[PDB]
Design a protein around this ligand. Structure first.
Ligand SMILES: CC(C)c1cc2ncccc2[nH]1
Ligand SMILES: CC(C)c1cc2ncccc2[nH]1
Lengths: 264, 265
């Protein structure tokens, strides 16, 4: 992988692996989300990151995902090469955004796009906060200053408000727990694990007859290594679903989201 | 990746990813086991597989892992490039073996080795069987005919008999269930998931103070997509050794047994 000529975005190519594909012999949406994280990390490394800046390290600040939105037109097959371009943008004092474009390396055609919103948090107190002037200055060095959006379209799916699923849910998968492979290097549950848990409550007959086209997930609270999660889904419709992940015991919400599926 | 000059082994290089590493910023043993599977698959594709031979597809036969043995001297760090060489050998009518050697791409030093035993099974009845003459002929085309062992040594750990853990276990992790990411393209639980489940019952204090040096795992029965597993571990021992057992949560049917050896950091 490498920064592009202007140094304001990063590109990397990936060959889809045997264990990364599902029943159609194409990459799962969790494989796509892991590749998005990987290219994001390689971009941060290339522009001088620790994924914190110097000021964030001095103030004990970290970024946490507030929302992830992914749209896939074609999933890459086992052995195919996918090229992913990523870039970041400051959104004033609210937070930052990381966007991605996925292309088939042979045809050059756009096969998917994604966008994520990140908010600042004090890592000790876990309290959210606005982005300071020093942090915005550090981002200006490696972000495009004119807007560059993976989802430009007015009133597009990536910015829609998601409601809270009402009990009783139509479908559920109860008692989900993370194992060590679900943790990142800092022993926190990897963001992609929550996507897997959301999808666990979709009936297998939908997965067998449809392809996932769009997923929008809001992240509200972290699942700890010793927590247990319930995944709830209700059809709202193409087939569309409303999702909710909550802690098994007290019912505390950890995520809410929506998925749109196209019949094969 | 590519077959070597003689066409009897295959090599591939991998850059260790951010999500593939644990607390020490080095690849987990599950990441190593997934890379071993990936290079094995690329080798099979390179020599004409479709992972069965022509005769196997005609008779509805498949290979299943009976044992996996991995020894790691140094885990590769995040961003490091690891080169893995793999090859297969026929073991008469018993089954086949796939071996691997892991090297640091910059130093050329061997950082790990692995060996796996595979047995033939009828895909429909799930009944094990001996390897036929036609299948052995197909393997002779792409295997070295003289022995080539990742674990040559006389009384090496890879061939040791593993006993069955006696209740009560010292440690346990109960109610483990596979999710869709744990399944392969044929909707079977990926072999590497069983390694993760074995390790779940090791106390976190051991993982925080030691590095896993050797793991030997016997596979006896498949965990179905709707099954639930219990992972049991008992210490048997600067080195710590454990005995492991995975069994179905309900009836207690054994699915795997194994041993791990850990060295203090
Ligand atoms: C699970 C992670 C991504 C996460 C925790 C959290 N807390 C507050 C707001 C957003 C948040 N996101
Ligand atoms: C690896 C799993 C699917 C497996 C099932 C099995 N059955 C008999 C002997 C070995 C076996 N291994």
């Amino acid at each position: 992988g490498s920064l592009t000529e202007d140094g304001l975005s990063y590109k990397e190519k990936f060959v889809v692996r045997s264990y990364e594909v599902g029943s159609n012999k194409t990459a799962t949406v969790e494989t796509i989300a892991n590749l998005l994280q990987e290219v994001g990390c390689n971009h941060a490394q290339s522009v001088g990151f620790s994924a914190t800046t110097t000021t964030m390290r001095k103030l004990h600040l970290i970024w946490v995902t507030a929302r992830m939105h992914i749209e896939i037109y074609k999933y890459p097959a086992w052995g195919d090469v996918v090229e992913i371009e990523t870039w970041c943008q400051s959104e004033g004092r609210i937070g930052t955004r990381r966007d991605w474009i996925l292309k088939d390396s042979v045809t050059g055609e756009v096969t998917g796009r994604a966008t994520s919103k990140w908010v600042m948090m004090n890592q000790d107190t876990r309290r959210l906060q606005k982005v300071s002037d020093d942090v915005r200055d550090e981002y200006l060095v490696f972000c495009p200053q004119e807007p560059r959006l993976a989802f430009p379209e007015e009133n597009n799916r990536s910015l829609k408000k998601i409601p809270k699923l009402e009990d009783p849910a139509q479908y559920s998968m109860i008692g989900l727990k993370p194992r060590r492979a679900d943790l990142d290097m800092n022993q926190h549950v990897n963001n992609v694990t929550y996507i897997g848990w959301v999808l666990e409550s979709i009936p297998q007959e939908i997965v067998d007859t449809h392809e996932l086209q769009v997923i929008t997930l809001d992240y509200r609270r972290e699942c700890q290594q010793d927590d247990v999660v319930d995944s709830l889904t209700t059809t709202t419709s193409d087939s569309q679903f409303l999702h909710l992940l909550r802690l098994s015991g007290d019912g505390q919400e950890i995520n809410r989201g929506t998925t749109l599926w196209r019949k094969k």
